[PDB]
Amino acid sequence: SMGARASVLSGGELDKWEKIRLRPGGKKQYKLKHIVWASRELERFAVNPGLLETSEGCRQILGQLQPSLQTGSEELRSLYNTIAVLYCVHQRIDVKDTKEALDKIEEEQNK
Amino acid sequence: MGARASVLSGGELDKWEKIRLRPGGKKQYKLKHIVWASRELERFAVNPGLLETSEGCRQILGQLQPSLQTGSEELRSLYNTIAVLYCVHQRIDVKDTKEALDKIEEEQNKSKKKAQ
Amino acid sequence: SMGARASVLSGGELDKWEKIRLRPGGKKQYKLKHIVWASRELERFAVNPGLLETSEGCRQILGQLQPSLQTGSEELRSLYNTIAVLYCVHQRIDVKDTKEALDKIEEEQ
Numbered sequence A: 001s002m003g004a005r006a007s008v009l010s011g012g013e014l015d016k017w018e019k020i021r022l023r024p025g026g027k028k029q030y031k032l033k034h035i036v037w038a039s040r041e042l043e044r045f046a047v048n049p050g051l052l053e054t055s056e057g058c059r060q061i062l063g064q065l066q067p068s069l070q071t072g073s074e075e076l077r078s079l080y081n082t083i084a085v086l087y088c089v090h091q092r093i094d095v096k097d098t099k100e101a102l103d104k105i106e107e108e109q110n111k
Numbered sequence B: 001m002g003a004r005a006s007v008l009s010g011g012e013l014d015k016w017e018k019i020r021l022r023p024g025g026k027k028q029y030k031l032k033h034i035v036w037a038s039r040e041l042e043r044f045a046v047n048p049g050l051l052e053t054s055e056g057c058r059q060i061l062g063q064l065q066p067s068l069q070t071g072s073e074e075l076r077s078l079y080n081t082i083a084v085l086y087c088v089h090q091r092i093d094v095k096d097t098k099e100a101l102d103k104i105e106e107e108q109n110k111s112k113k114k115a116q
Numbered sequence C: 001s002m003g004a005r006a007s008v009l010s011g012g013e014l015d016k017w018e019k020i021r022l023r024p025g026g027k028k029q030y031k032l033k034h035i036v037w038a039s040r041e042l043e044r045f046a047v048n049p050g051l052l053e054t055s056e057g058c059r060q061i062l063g064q065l066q067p068s069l070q071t072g073s074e075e076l077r078s079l080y081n082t083i084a085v086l087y088c089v090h091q092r093i094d095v096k097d098t099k100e101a102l103d104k105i106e107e108e109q
Ligand SMILES: O=P(O)(O)O[C@H]1[C@@H](OP(=O)(O)O)[C@@H](OP(=O)(O)O)[C@@H](OP(=O)(O)O)[C@@H](OP(=O)(O)O)[C@@H]1OP(=O)(O)O
Pocket: A018, A019, A020, A029
């Protein structure tokens, strides 16, 4: 029975999560399965998955993951992209797709 | 013998099996913990032979400490074991993991405070 | 029987790959398998395995692997070693064994 489908995002967080599209202009949208995947991934990399539960938990993860980005595989970048959106959701920063999330994260990063 | 378990000498296993995992708790360290730590090290692509010496463990802890604040329970357990393992090699008598960690940065403190 | 070996080295790079020896004065030499292995080794470490197809790709993987090298396991150093030779091949640097390859990588760094 239940797992990380309940501890990472709140109900309202969740309903905004399942409206965000994976690729800009695309058809497919984040589901619970991506959150489960990301949490199990974090522990397979020895990172604390509880950090997914808060906006700075993810801020910390993304800081630790980013230097691996250039050389990272498709798996790494998906994990990072998912955690970027989770950050957007925890911050209540409205996003339409993954791309807009990385954008807003860099804009917040420039100031 | 035992391949991964022999990082400790016969005498070191004797004090090893006396050190409590958590302070005031009664469960203690066993072979299963060293075997586990070794296997975890090579699962993080680190050389398990480093557990054989005080500075093998010194090097491992330095390589792991950056990952500690965001690390998972398995990484903190690994660090804690290697911390205790370092104190055993160093003949530093400790009673639980907390003591091992506490002395660990007394070492890491004086290293920096006479450097400065 | 799927490939993943013609993606990394060209046919002529392959002919020189297969003359490099694993160790100086040694008898054993690099083979296709060393590249298959290196490639899956990079996906298990979360790295993009396409970076092996270009010298620039390898140059970067080496940079991000070097820090782990002092405390790294036998498995890590063999990955690093294999990719160091891959680099010189891509770079048209001629080496006879893993040691020469590692040395030249050293002086570049
Ligand atoms: O993206 P919109 O142009 O805004 O239009 C709608 C809509 O938005 P409205 O609230 O204005 O009706 C719904 O979002 P919800 O009310 O359900 O929260 C939604 O409706 P249904 O899925 O129930 O049909 C659905 O898609 P989704 O929930 O998958 O985002 C869809 O968005 P799209 O127009 O992009 O399909």
